Design a protein around this ligand. Structure first.
Ligand code: ZN
Lengths: 70, 68, 68, 51, 277, 287
C-alpha cells in the first residue's frame, strides 16, 4: 500500500500541469501562487519540492484542477 | 425483571429531546427496547404516542419489534 | 451459561445483532443475548419464598446507577 | 476566524465556489519593497572599523 | 413506499468503459446515452451496458434522444441477444463537476415518468484522471415529500452511507432536488483477467537484460550520490550526537534501489547463461 | 498489408460480454462480430466492435448465416455515433478456426479490403494475449506448391486509450500490482519468464514431433525461423566471454556489498538509538 501511495503522488505530479509564479510561502506545505491565467490562488505545496530552491517569484508548475504546486 | 424493573427514563427522555432524524428515532426506539427487555413495561412507548407515531415504513416494523 | 456451557441463544443473538449493519430490524436479536443476573431460591413447592441473601461487600460496587 | 483579526487592506484566502474567508494571509507588500528588507546580515563588524 | 438509502446501481465493466470512452470521445460537447439494464427487485439497478446517442448539437435534453435511433438499435440489440430495458440515461459533464442542472432535472423527470426507478448518471471525463473515476448516479426528490418534512429517502440499513457528498453537488443542490445513489461495480473474474492482459508483461521482458553500459552508468551515478549522502549522514550523526532524518532516509532509498537492480540483473544473467545453453 | 494490430480493453470486454450473453440465452461454440478501428500506417487500431447475428451447421462446416444487413445497419449507427471508426475487420470467439473462416473473411472483404480476423479467446490463458490476428492472403506460392486461400498471422498487441486506461485501472485497483520493481516481484517476473520460455519450447518441440512423424507437412517458414533461432543461440563457454562475465559479476557484487554494508551500519545506528531510548525511558520510570 505504501508503494501504491507513492505511485499516486508521483502521478499527481503529472504532465499537463499549468505554469505559474510562486509568489511567497505562507506556511509549511502551503503557499501563494499566481497562475498565468491571471489569478492568484492560495494553494497547497506537495512534499519535497526543495523548499530551499522554492524562493519567492519562482516559476512552478501547478495542478491543472486543484492548482496545487507540484 | 418486573419486580426489579429499576429503569431510568430521564436519559431516554433526553435522547428523545435531542433526536432530529429518523435514524436516531429508530435508535431511541431500539434503546428503549433494550432497556425494557423482559420487563414488559412499555411506559415510554405508551407516553410518546406522537413520537412513536412519527415512524414510517420499516421504522414501524422496528417499533413493533421493540414492543416484542 | 453459568456452568460454562456455551449459550446458543446468546451467541445467535449476538451474531444476528452484529448483522444489523445490513438490516436494522435484526438489531433486536440482541434480546436473546440478555441473561437475567438473578439468583432465585425455590423450595420444594416450586414457589418463591421470602429469603434474605447475604453478600459481604460494600453497597456501592454492585449498586444500581443513581438517577441523575 | 474572528472578525477582529480581519483588518482593512489585509490578504485573506477564500474557498472555491463559496468565497468563504478561511485564512488571513501575510500582508501584501510590493515585491520591490519586499526584496528590499535585509534577510542575511552582512559580515562586517565594529571590529573591522578603525578610527 | 419510500426508496431507502440502500439502493445501488451496479455498473458493469463494459458499461463503465463505454461511458468513459464516449465522454472523452466527444468532450467538450455534452455526450449522452441510454442504459440497457435491469431493476431486479427494489435495491438493484443493474446497468448491464450503455447505448451512445448521436451528437444532436442542441446540448443534452429530451430533444437529443432521437427516439427512432433508440428504437431501431434497441430492436437490433435484442436481435443480437441483449434484451434489456432502458434503466435511465447517462450524460457527461466535461470538467464542471458531477451533478444535475435544470435541463438534466427535466430529462430525469421525464425518465422517471416513463418508469419511476430510472437513475441519471453523470461522468466527468476531464477530472476522471487515471486512478480516480468521478462518476455519480442520481434520482430526483418529489417536490411534495421534501416540504412534507419527510426525508427524501428511507434509511433502513447502514449500507448506502459511507459516501461523502461532493461540495460541488451540495452547492448545486445535491439533496434539495435529487439524491446521490451508491455506485457498485460488478467485476467478473474473467473480465478482470482480460483487463490484466492490458499491461501484462511478456515472458520476454521478464527474462530480458538491461543494457550493460546503461547499468554500469546507473550504478556509478547512484554510488556517487550515495557517497555524498554518506558524507552528509556522517556530519549529521556527528553534530546531533555532539549537541546531544533526510540523509539516513535518502541513503536507505539509494541502497535499496542499488541492491534490487544489481541483484535482479545478476540473477537474470545467471538464468540466461543456464537456460540458453 | 498490415504489420501490427492493437486491440483495446473495450473490445475485449465487449467480446467477452457478447459471448457470455449468447451462451446464456443458448449454446454455441462461437459468436461473431465486426471490429471497428482506424489505420495509422500499417498499424490497425481496433477500438470498438459489435456483435452480429450468426449461426451455422457445425456438421456441414460450410453453411452459416452471417447477417450482412444487420452488419451494415449497426455500422451505420456506429458511424453516426462516431465517425473515425470504419469497419476494419471481424472477430469470432472460437479457440480454433473453421472452414467457414475463409468464407466469412471473403464476405467481410466487401466491407473492408484489408479485412482482418481477430480470434479473441474468452477462455483466459496465462502466458499470451487473448487475441490472435489473421489476414487472408492468397498468392502463388513461390514454394511451387498448390496455393489455397488461407490465413497468415498478424502481430497483435493490447493498447488502451487514456479514457480506457482510467477505467481499466479503476476496475483492477483491488488486484493491481505495484508499478515499480520490488525485488520479490522482479524475481517472480524472471520465474514467469522461464515458465513462458519453457512453454514456447515445448510447443515448438511438439510441432517438430508431429511434422517429423508425418501428421503435418513441413512448413518452410517455420523451418527457416527455427534454423535462424539455432544459429542465434549464443556460446557461453567462450573464454573471452567467461572473463567479461566474471568481471561484470564482480562489479555488480561489489556494488551489492557496499550497499549491504551501508544498510547494516544504518541498522546498527537505529539499534543504538533504540537502546539509548530504552535506557532513558527506564531511568525516567525508575526516578
Ligand atoms: Zn447536464
Amino acid at each position: 500500500e505504501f508503494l501504491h501511495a507513492q505511485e499516486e503522488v508521483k502521478r499527481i505530479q503529472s504532465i499537463p500541469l499549468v505554469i505559474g509564479q510562486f509568489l511567497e510561502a505562507v506556511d509549511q506545505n502551503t503557499a501563494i501562487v499566481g497562475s498565468t491565467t491571471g489569478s492568484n490562488y492560495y494553494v497547497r505545496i506537495l512534499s519535497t519540492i526543495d523548499r530551499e530552491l522554492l524562493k519567492p517569484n519562482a516559476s512552478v508548475a501547478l495542478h491543472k484542477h486543484s492548482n496545487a504546486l507540484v | 425483571l418486573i419486580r426489579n424493573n429499576n429503569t431510568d427514563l430521564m436519559i431516554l427522555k433526553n435522547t428523545k429531546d435531542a433526536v432530529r432524524n429518523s435514524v436516531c428515532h429508530t435508535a431511541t426506539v431500539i434503546a428503549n427496547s433494550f432497556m425494557h427487555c423482559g420487563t414488559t413495561s412499555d411506559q415510554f412507548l405508551r407516553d410518546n404516542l406522537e413520537w412513536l407515531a412519527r415512524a414510517t415504513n420499516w421504522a414501524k416494523f422496528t417499533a413493533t419489534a421493540s414492543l416484542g | 451459561s453459568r456452568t460454562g456451557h456455551t449459550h446458543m441463544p446468546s451467541v445467535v443473538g449476538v451474531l444476528v445483532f452484529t448483522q444489523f449493519w445490513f438490516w436494522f430490524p435484526l438489531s433486536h436479536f440482541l434480546s436473546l443475548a440478555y441473561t437475567p443476573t438473578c439468583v432465585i431460591g425455590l423450595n420444594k413447592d416450586l414457589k418463591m419464598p421470602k429469603v434474605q441473601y447475604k453478600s459481604n461487600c460494600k453497597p456501592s460496587t454492585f449498586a444500581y446507577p443513581a438517577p441523575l | 476566524i474572528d472578525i477582529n483579526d480581519v483588518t482593512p487592506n489585509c490578504r485573506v484566502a477564500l474557498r472555491n465556489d463559496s468565497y468563504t474567508l478561511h485564512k488571513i494571509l501575510p500582508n501584501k507588500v510590493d515585491p520591490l519593497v519586499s526584496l528590499m528588507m535585509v534577510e542575511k546580515v552582512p559580515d562586517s563588524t565594529y571590529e573591522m572599523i578603525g578610527g | 413506499p419510500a426508496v431507502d438509502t440502500a439502493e445501488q446501481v451496479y455498473i458493469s465493466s463494459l458499461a463503465l468503459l463505454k461511458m468513459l470512452k464516449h465522454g472523452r470521445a466527444g468532450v467538450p460537447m455534452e455526450v449522452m446515452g441510454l442504459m440497457l439494464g435491469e431493476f431486479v427487485d427494489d435495491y438493484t439497478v443493474r446497468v448491464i451496458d450503455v447505448f451512445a446517442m448521436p451528437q444532436s448539437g442542441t446540448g443534452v435534453s429530451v430533444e437529443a434522444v432521437d427516439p427512432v435511433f433508440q428504437a431501431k438499435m434497441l430492436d437490433m440489440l435484442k436481435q443480437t441477444g441483449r434484451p434489456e430495458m432502458v434503466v435511465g440515461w447517462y450524460h457527461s459533464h466535461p470538467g464542471f463537476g458531477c451533478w444535475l442542472s435544470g435541463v438534466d432535472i427535466n430529462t430525469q423527470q421525464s425518465f422517471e415518468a416513463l418508469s419511476e426507478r430510472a437513475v441519471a448518471v453523470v461522468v466527468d471525463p476531464i477530472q476522471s484522471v487515471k486512478g480516480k473515476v468521478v462518476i455519480d448516479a442520481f434520482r430526483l426528490i418529489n417536490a411534495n415529500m421534501m416540504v412534507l418534512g419527510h426525508e427524501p429517502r428511507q434509511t433502513t440499513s447502514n449500507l448506502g452511507h459511507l459516501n461523502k457528498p461532493s461540495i460541488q453537488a451540495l452547492i448545486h443542490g445535491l439533496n434539495r432536488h435529487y439524491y446521490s445513489i451508491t455506485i457498485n461495480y460488478r467485476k467478473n473474474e474473467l473480465e478482470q483477467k482480460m483487463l490484466l492482459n492490458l499491461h501484462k508483461k511478456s515472458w520476454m521482458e521478464g527474462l530480458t537484460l538491461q543494457d550493460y553500459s546503461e547499468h554500469c552508468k546507473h550504478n556509478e551515478s547512484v554510488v556517487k550520490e550515495m557517497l555524498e549522502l554518506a558524507k552528509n549522514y556522517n556530519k549529521a550523526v556527528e553534530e546531533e550526537d555532539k549537541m546531544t532524518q533526510d540523509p539516513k532516509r535518502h541513503l536507505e532509498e539509494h541502497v535499496d534501489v542499488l541492491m534490487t537492480s544489481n541483484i535482479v540483473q545478476c540473477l537474470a544473467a545467471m538464468l540466461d547463461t543456464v537456460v540458453f545453453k | 498489408a498490415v504489420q501490427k494490430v492493437v486491440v483495446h480493453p473495450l473490445v475485449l470486454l465487449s467480446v467477452v460480454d457478447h459471448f457470455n450473453r449468447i451462451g446464456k440465452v443458448g449454446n454455441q461454440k462461437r459468436v461473431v462480430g465486426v471490429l471497428l478501428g482506424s489505420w495509422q500506417k500499417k498499424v490497425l487500431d481496433v477500438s470498438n466492435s459489435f456483435a452480429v447475428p450468426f449461426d451455422e451447421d457445425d456438421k456441414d462446416d460450410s453453411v452459416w448465416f452471417l447477417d450482412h444487413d444487420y452488419l451494415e445497419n449497426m455500422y451505420g449507427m456506429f458511424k453516426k455515433v462516431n465517425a473515425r471508426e470504419r469497419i476494419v475487420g471481424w472477430y469470432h470467439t472460437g479457440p480454433k478456426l473453421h472452414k467457414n473462416d475463409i468464407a466469412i473473411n471473403e464476405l467481410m472483404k466487401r466491407y473492408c479490403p484489408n479485412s482482418v480476423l481477430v480470434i479473441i479467446d474468452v477462455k483466459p490463458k496465462d502466458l499470451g494475449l487473448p487475441t490472435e490476428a489473421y489476414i487472408s492472403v492468397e498468392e502463388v506460392h513461390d514454394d511451387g506448391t498448390p496455393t489455397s486461400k488461407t490465413f497468415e498471422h498478424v502481430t497483435s498487441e493490447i493498447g488502451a486509450e487514456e479514457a480506457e486506461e482510467v477505467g481499466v485501472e479503476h476496475l483492477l485497483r483491488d488486484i493491481k500490482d505495484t508499478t515499480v520493481g520490488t525485488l520479490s516481484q522482479r524475481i517472480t517476473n524472471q520465474v514467469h519468464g522461464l515458465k513462458g520460455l519453457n512453454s514456447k519450447l515445448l510447443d515448438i518441440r511438439s510441432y517438430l514431433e508431429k511434422v517429423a512423424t508425418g501428421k503435418l507437412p513441413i512448413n518452410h517458414q517455420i523451418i527457416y525461423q527455427l534454423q535462424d533461432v539455432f544459429n542465434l543461440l549464443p556460446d557461453v563457454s567462450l573464454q573471452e566471454f567467461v572473463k567479461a562475465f566474471y568481471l561484470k559479476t564482480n562489479d555488480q557484487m561489489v556494488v551489492v556489498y557496499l550497499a549491504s554494508l551501508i544498510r547494516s551500519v544504518v541498522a546498527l545506528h537505529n539499534l543504538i538509538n533504540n537502546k539509548i531510548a530504552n535506557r532513558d525511558a527506564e531511568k525516567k520510570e525508575g526516578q
